[PDB]
Amino acid sequence: PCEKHSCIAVIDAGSTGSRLHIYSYDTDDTNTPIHIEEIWNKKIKPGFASIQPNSVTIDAYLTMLLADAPIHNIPVYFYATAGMRLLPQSQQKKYYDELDYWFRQQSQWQLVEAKTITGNDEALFDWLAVNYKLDTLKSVQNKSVGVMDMGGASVQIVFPMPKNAEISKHNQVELNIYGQNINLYVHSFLGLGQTEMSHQFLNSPSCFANDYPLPDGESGQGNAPSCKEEVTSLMNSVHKVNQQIQPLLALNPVNEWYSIGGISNLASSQLFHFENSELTNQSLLQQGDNQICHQQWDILNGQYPDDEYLYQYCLLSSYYYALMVDGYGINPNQTIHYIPPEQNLDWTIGVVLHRA
């Protein structure tokens, strides 16, 4: 495989574990990768930012992740995401000093870069991965495509926008893909991913099914519009989502939205009814409110006893609506396409396109 084509390894060191992807590819006459295929992968737990940063621990982790890979003497990018961004910087440096030493002691792997990427860099890769799979990159479009990543610890949004001198340079990227210049607005909200954000709402009765036992001893008394208003306060007062995103998106409309991350998991539940791997926010909120928020929990749990995430779906439906409608300003009747787990569309494909 790496005899007849180019190969590259990308490690996604995420909040709950690290995922190695090895890709083969060819390069076309615009100096852009084509024919990108995943030829091997490996996942390890727990997250890199949760292990002790010393040589024995890092050696055992990187050995577990890399030792069995079938191929040798290829470039590697090690990119940590939001879990590492949460750590103080002085603590991050301990990991990277150990990791840099480990890669210098061997030869199977040619380390190009090991770093914590910003959420803006992650948003760029998210947009390239989705558009590669949609086959919208090889041609000038005349339809704006926007991507949202609904991640566990951060969320990303990215969409085409001409260069704007009045906007931070860190929220704008310029790249040329398949011969065409592209300008994207990028943004990430650290802490607004579903797992991290959930930690603020666990004792909010509006966000759980009726009679769900909250950790403080109180009972759920669900109401999606109430839970949404709570979540919208965190989004707009702390993260300033609407103030930053909504005016820009209004002037740079997106014709199609695609979302990666947690929405398919929710949308695929037997409790929801969505078709065409898409949803509208109005439908999402109505179905969460009727089927989970105002539902008696014991009866619901009895009908779906093995779905370990079902209890969060009043909060999650409210939260997705708060982010997309109240934060980004998307119309509640706009279609959002979501991409399933069972597509194995991974943001690391964007690293291949931009950096290989």
Place this chain on the structure above:
Amino acid sequence: PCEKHSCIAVIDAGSTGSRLHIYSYDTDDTNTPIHIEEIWNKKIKPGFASIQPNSVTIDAYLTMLLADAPIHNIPVYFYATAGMRLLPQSQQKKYYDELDYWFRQQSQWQLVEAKTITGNDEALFDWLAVNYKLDTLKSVQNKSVGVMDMGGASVQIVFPMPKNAEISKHNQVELNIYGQNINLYVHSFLGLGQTEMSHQFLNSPSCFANDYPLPDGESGQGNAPSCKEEVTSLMNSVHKVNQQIQPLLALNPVNEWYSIGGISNLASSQLFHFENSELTNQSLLQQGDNQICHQQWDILNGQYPDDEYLYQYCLLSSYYYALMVDGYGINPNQTIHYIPPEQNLDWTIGVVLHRA
């Protein structure tokens, strides 16, 4: 030691690790423990809620924590706190089924109870521990004593309040200590502990020193009143702190406040000037704003290069003021006593008093 006196073991299974405390005590003629002394302790990492819940992992963790203890055939309470409260309940059950089996297979340890305690139960123990050490329990007081725990994942507040039929039963406790009936209001806010809450503010420039490098690439531009207003939005809109606490505290005034948890760490920094192991909120906010928020970061870090927490002290000073003044409604000129690490005052003493 356990030959001449009673003994009891309390395990604090907290967010970042578990701490075993073995106490000796005697019992007075009111059936209340006296002479409570810690005769052994043991700390292990990481947090119980972060390890895999299977028999090999739990056996290795509990062995590491308990095997070396000097004494045998004593009652044990295993109490997990906010880190376990964050986990879904179905996941918590896996831990407790393994733990219950492990204790049934041996005899050094007589397990009384293993559970996740609510933040309300934790607040009760916090108040008893502080008042035991202040020697205010053995006598009827005529001065109301309030306690705040500024924890890593939740915060607690507790103060005397007569029984009120209009208030949740879960936020009120009744107990008799040294022959005297006590009625306390208790409350906990899960997610508002300093570590968990910080995860929402890391890209907020008002909360960091000038030019501090935020994870998204932007620079700190500190301003304590701005960072405080951000934190107050999360406290009052999501957690509803002021709506719940402020009216009750206004009608049930506290004459002395004591705080356990993170404030001593901050207040003890060479950058702050506090005397008498106490502070006022007005002074805390002014000193954070002048010494950290509006301070040039590179120069500050150069003068205090080994203080790994200093970078957070604009956020932390703002956050403590937001919680105490904007959330609980405490006057900015009111003295708050804080108890240092170097007192080893631990909330588990409250378990001895209430349950031994």
